[PDB]
Design a protein around this ligand. Structure first.
Ligand code: FMN
Ligand code: FMN
Ligand code: XRO
Ligand code: XRO
Lengths: 313, 313
């Protein structure tokens, strides 16, 4: 009947939102997402200063998904903070701000500034652990001690409930270690699974060329390629983090895909590639499709089936 | 125009072979692979003792690929060694034997006894590193210290050229570290990229259930899902291991997919999921399709384009 829900001391019309980075870079983009049927919106990951990002072409899409090496192009933290503080109409839907500083100190500096705006206006923080490659060391969520430092320092600096955007893991020991790190931090109230599947490579057969310019054609994968990976991460963290929410991201094109994310454990469902390809109309279709599948199954609420994927024996 | 290759002191009619685990567990399976049009075959990864593997269902396939948690079911090393020593007809095509011991000691035990048969009959060793070690630790090739130990021990015990089967990596740091480990070992003459994309989760919407029984539905992904991941890993190791061959595996359903692998750097091209689904007739189709692309482009041999993927600017 209706898909409205309450999470994190906020009310949402439905569980759908954009994925960080998609339709959320400029004021125009944020106003468009706010005008859409989505339940929420999140801003592009920001740095302290503005960034141009990588040379073009840096995003390409195909029937099975997309590849990107954007390079963190963004208008800078001051812009996103001003949007949260002065421009966003909170009567329309909640706002999440994504932060992706290139060091712990930069993240700390941004969160200290965000915190009073969070208290006054209710903007929510999504901390992005992914970043540009630094030769000689791994991405932060793949370096468990670095992750722990980031979360400790942000937790201290911010002091309020926040969430973390995670890259996918592929190994059950890794799920156990990552989840135990996250569970050390009671202020981490949601985990968003997943960011793009890192460093894929799309090749065009006719031209015999890679399709994006940066990184010799390597970039993160989204879309249909990554749905089972996304579900696996959603469920793994849903099981391991009983005191946290899980937000699902990856491979959502349909209400059925959203239903699968919710069965795995998702509270919110984020839409990246499909949104970039279809535009913000997609949210009315996703809502219609998810309510149709609920009606055919006899489900009246999301809670009835969230996390209730069945195992064999 | 021809698909012939000469590598590792063997001659191959064409680059195609099965992926380890598909159509290669029983004598019947190996005879079928031998009778097919493939250029080579590999045996199922084996252990010292025979294994039943995990409970069924343990493999499922879908339009975009497959998921599996087989659990290393196999006839045991002695069976595969006898096939290599006494049964295979080396006049038809080369044989690779895949080994996947559950400890370094188990691998050492097997390769000591494989050595004299390798030397006399020319069977080629593929050591599977995308394999469990101690439960609660990551798979061997995700634990770089363990990987080094396995390679040191196997290189000393075997004493002949061999190759390794690698899981996919997702972080540039891991490409760099993994290739540097491999480059420590001059006896590693080929690198097969990639094994399954680990611990994905497929959920069936109608039944609200996972589709395989082991591991609460989690298992390794193959097929269309994984082609850009596979291409990335082939190219990454092709660039970082200039003194080694790279074999490509992942997401091959067509001659076009094979051509992309080869542009990325692949010598041999292995076929898993699509061979499981279509059967051994796939090899004739792949050969025809690849030859047609080569004829349209004016390429007469594989070397004309191997590793010749173009980057932008
Ligand atoms: C063009 C583009 C830019 C993105 N930028 C960011 C970002 O700034 N911050 C972030 O957390 N994830 C970013 N992502 C990742 C997406 O939020 C999402 O995790 C990923 O695309 C998987 O979802 P999908 O399968 O729906 O595309 C970006 C993705 C794309 C396609
Ligand atoms: C049913 C099944 C069993 C497999 N068993 C093994 C194995 O014993 N050893 C191994 O190296 N890889 C094994 N794999 C991985 C495949 O060799 C291959 O790396 C993976 O399926 C990706 O290739 P694809 O996209 O063509 O399926 C198995 C895959 C499947 C589907
Ligand atoms: N290009 C490139 C490498 C890179 C990878 C990740 C990031 C963080 C921002 C980001 C981006 C991006 O701006 O490239 N793309 C994603 O798919 N996920 C993200 O989290 C920045 C830069
Ligand atoms: N089930 C389960 C966990 C597991 C994962 C990998 C292996 C090694 C053998 C193997 C298997 C398998 O036998 O499950 N499947 C793959 O896709 N690749 C492999 O290399 C053994 C066991």
């Amino acid at each position: 009947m209706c898909l409205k829900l309450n999470l994190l001391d906020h009310v949402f019309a439905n569980p759908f939102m954009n994925a960080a980075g998609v339709l959320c870079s400029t004021e125009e983009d944020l106003r468009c997402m706010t005008a859409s049927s989505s339940g929420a919106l999140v801003s592009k990951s920001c740095t302290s200063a503005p960034r141009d990002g990588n040379p073009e072409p840096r995003y390409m899409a195909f029937p099975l998904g997309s590849i990107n090496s954007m390079g963190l192009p963004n208008l800078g933290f001051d812009f996103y903070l001003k949007y949260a503080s002065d421009l966003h109409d909170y009567s329309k839907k909640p706002l999440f701000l994504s932060i992706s500083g290139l060091s712990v100190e930069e993240n700390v500096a941004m969160v200290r500034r965000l915190a009073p705006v969070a208290q006054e206006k209710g903007v929510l923080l999504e901390l992005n652990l992914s970043c540009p490659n630094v030769p000689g060391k791994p991405q932060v969520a793949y370096d468990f001690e670095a992750m722990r430092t980031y979360l400790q320092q942000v937790s201290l600096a911010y002091g309020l409930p926040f969430g973390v955007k995670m890259p996918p893991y592929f190994d059950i020991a890794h799920f156990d270690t990552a989840a135990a790190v996250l569970n050390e931090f009671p202020l981490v109230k949601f985990v968003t699974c997943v960011n793009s599947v890192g460093n894929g490579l799309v090749i065009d057969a006719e031209s015999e060329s890679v399709v994006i310019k940066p990184k010799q054609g390597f970039g993160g994968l989204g879309g249909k390629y990554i749905l089972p990976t996304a579900l696996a991460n959603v469920n793994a963290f849903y099981r391991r983090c009983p005191d946290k929410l899980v937000f699902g991201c990856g491979g959502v094109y349909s209400g059925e895909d959203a239903f699968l994310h919710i069965l795995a454990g998702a509270s919110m469902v984020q839409v990246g590639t499909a949104l970039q390809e279809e535009g913000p109309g997609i949210f009315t279709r996703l809502e219609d499709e998810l309510l149709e599948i609920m009606a055919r199954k006899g489900y009246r609420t999301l809670e009835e089936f969230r996390g209730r994927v069945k195992t064999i024996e």
